[PDB]
Amino acid sequence: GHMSFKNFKVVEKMIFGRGSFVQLDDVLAAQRKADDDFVVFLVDDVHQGKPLEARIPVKAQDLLIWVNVDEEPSTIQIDALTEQVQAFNGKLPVSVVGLGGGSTMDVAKAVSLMLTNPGGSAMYQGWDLIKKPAVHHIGIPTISGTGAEASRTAVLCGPVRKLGLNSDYTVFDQIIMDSELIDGVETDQWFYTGMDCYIHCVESLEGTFLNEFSKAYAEKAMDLCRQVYLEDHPEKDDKLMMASFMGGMSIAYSQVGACHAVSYGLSYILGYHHGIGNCIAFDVLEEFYPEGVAEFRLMMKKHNITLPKNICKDLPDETIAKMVAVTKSMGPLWANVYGPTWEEKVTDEMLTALFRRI
Amino acid sequence: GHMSFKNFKVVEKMIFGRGSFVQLDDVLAAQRKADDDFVVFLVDDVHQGKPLEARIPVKAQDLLIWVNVDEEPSTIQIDALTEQVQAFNGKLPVSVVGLGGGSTMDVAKAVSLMLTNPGGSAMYQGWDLIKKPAVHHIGIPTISGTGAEASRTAVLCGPVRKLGLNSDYTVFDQIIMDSELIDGVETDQWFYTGMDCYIHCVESLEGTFLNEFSKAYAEKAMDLCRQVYLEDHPEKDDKLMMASFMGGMSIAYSQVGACHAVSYGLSYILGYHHGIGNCIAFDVLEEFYPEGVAEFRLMMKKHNITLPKNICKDLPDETIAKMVAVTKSMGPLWANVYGPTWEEKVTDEMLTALFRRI
Ligand SMILES: NC(=O)c1ccc[n+]([C@@H]2O[C@H](COP(=O)([O-])OP(=O)(O)OC[C@H]3O[C@@H](n4cnc5c(N)ncnc54)[C@H](O)[C@@H]3O)[C@@H](O)[C@H]2O)c1
Ligand SMILES: NC(=O)c1ccc[n+]([C@@H]2O[C@H](COP(=O)([O-])OP(=O)(O)OC[C@H]3O[C@@H](n4cnc5c(N)ncnc54)[C@H](O)[C@@H]3O)[C@@H](O)[C@H]2O)c1
Ligand SMILES: [Cl-]
Ligand SMILES: [Cl-]
Ligand SMILES: [Cl-]
Ligand SMILES: [Cl-]
Ligand SMILES: [Zn+2]
Ligand SMILES: [Zn+2]
């Protein structure tokens, strides 16, 4: 035998450019072989009533689903959506479009997978469980930072917990990166989601699992984040969309760390959304990432960002302990932070003290 | 109608990591459906007698061709190689491997194309002329900087001139980036080929045709080049391989400029190789790229690089004029430098004066 590095599968086709949403209809047309071939549009319901709605190239035969992301995606939701598509028409759609953030894009990835992989989405939560190629699927981010447009995963809250459908088949066939679509995101959520990128970079770049491929992508996306959140460039939306993209590219040969691991306890037990949750966690992690936290804090001041505080002050001991146990279980993240002796530092007590500061 | 941005097609699968050459045999095995399915290895003849030769996973049925790159690739060469493969076996090979620099990788791309596209390689020099998908093809760079592992082109000297087979079908199906394979490149050629990356970045980043996608890739590869040629990092070979890669990625929404346009006259009339030729040209282009040329010159001093000088001092006027006319004809490059009024600055006299300084 020999050791193997990951053979990394990327999004094969991409359009970058402001206004490029207008090209979606042509990309779709190339998949519509028959007159009646149809497309599923999964669209974040934030876009309902906004200028983008009128531009979505929906045909008479197509299925437009408004996705509500008040809660992040779940296996139940995926399974209901996949049955909806199945009841809508006897034919497979020729493409599934995810038009939204990480949540909606992940919904589109997962639906496109479940349309060709029976048994429900929970069954495929894990690594390389998907047996058949997905329906052709297109990702179109309308808020930048998760890198979900680029990744091989779709993160779903299952019967227990948030875990991804990781597979080469998960990857979008096509992405369209049109930063006009993000120009209206509100300041706080713009900050929360873009900090998903920045924080991920900081974590990855301090990790024990890192090569120069991932390092170069993470460095440059962090650089782009600094330009967006500390400077004032006319191309700020294109820069942030590019950062997001580069972040996603960096995932291959890197890992997250202490912020994601903590954030994961907050999300799973207290229902905090992914972006805000990482920001909340990062602000108590100055001992892990002193430079990144200091810079993050200047970024927050620059943009009048106020994080909620005292979230965990009065919670029952038992609820803390549940977050502690979830966080502690994320071995590969803690190994990324501390190396193979991580179990000696990642204690119930050290974690409890972090959560009590949030 | 609407405007369209390019829908950029990238290498779909990639392995990055030192030692990953050992994985080539497994990647090949996945293409060998029948016992007797064969592979073509196109290998730069520099590797003959070197440690790499013994490691190439050549099977009894396979065809190993030593490619001599004393001259850069030509349509005649491509056509002869494609006929050799055709005479070797009645079946199509299941993959074509290019193991070498830009020259060898481009030979592999072009052979893999010609095996499924009859009529000779000259006929396909241009844009999107290829009618049928290529044979599965794998690029494995053994000297870093051209970005040819990433690009949609294969540059061949045709009946006239160097022009590429540009097509989405040209793109490698798989790249393997193993910087162990570049650790032995000699100082001067290491410099010439890595400067292909750096100079390309400088040109692109000053261009009128540039978006933030290409800008971020070009910036980061230029950053990596600076780390390699001005600093002294233990990971210098991984950094340069990554720079090369990122350079290739930047091509989509950018263009070259005055260095490539000049260099092209030198190559076509005087037979200068691509890397050295760009270095030779760049050293007279301080008025176009003052900062890049100054830095390039410190890089040369750091590595005891001496460029040949007085190349054109005594040439016949007529030979200068041929280089001038070739260089002047590269409109899109000159438009990248000066914008749509470029014809008023790009004169016979201005170009002649540059060439007489080389
Ligand atoms: N697949 C992956 O690799 C990956 C990576 C990181 C995170 N994630 C997942 O991504 C999800 C979070 O994604 P996210 O941070 O983009 O947030 P999101 O998709 O939940 O959206 C956040 C909010 O912004 C709103 N929004 C979206 N586009 C907008 C626009 N143009 N204008 C105004 N508002 C807009 C949404 O309606 C929602 O209120 C989580 O479920 C997380 O698990 C996935
Ligand atoms: N397809 C593209 O997008 C693209 C882009 C830029 C340039 N190009 C083309 O690339 C070609 C030049 O490529 P290049 O600069 O890599 O040089 P190359 O392929 O010609 O090789 C240069 C020299 O280095 C030697 N070499 C290669 N690997 C080595 C190793 N491991 N150790 C020692 N010596 C080694 C070669 O034998 C040769 O002498 C030109 O034909 C140019 O037109 C193509
Ligand atoms: Cl829904
Ligand atoms: Cl929340
Ligand atoms: Cl040859
Ligand atoms: Cl030469
Ligand atoms: Zn995240
Ligand atoms: Zn070049």
Curated annotation (Swiss-Prot), chains A, B:
Keyword field contains Manganese: yes
A GO molecular-function descriptor: alcohol dehydrogenase (NAD+) activity
Segments crossing the lipid bilayer: none
Reactions catalysed: 3-deoxy-alpha-D-manno-oct-2-ulosonate + O2 = 3,8-dideoxy-8-oxo-alpha-D-manno-octulosonate + H2O2
Regulation: Inhibited by EDTA.
Pathway membership: Bacterial outer membrane biogenesis; lipopolysaccharide biosynthesis
Keyword Manganese carried by entry: yes
InterPro entries cross-referenced by the UniProt entry: ADH_Fe/GldA, ADH_Fe_C, Alcohol_dehydrogenase_Fe
CDD domains listed in its UniProt record: Fe-ADH_KdnB-like
One GO BP: lipopolysaccharide biosynthetic process
E.C. number: 1.1.3.48
Deletion consequences: A double kdnA/kdnB deletion mutant shows increased sensitivity to polymyxin B and bile salts.
Family note: Belongs to the iron-containing alcohol dehydrogenase family.
Biological role: Catalyzes the first step of the biosynthesis of Kdo8N (8-amino-3,8-dideoxy-D-manno-octulosonate) from Kdo (3-deoxy-D-manno-octulosonate).
Note: Kdo8N is found in lipopolysaccharides of members of the Shewanella genus.
Protein name: 3-deoxy-alpha-D-manno-octulosonate 8-oxidase
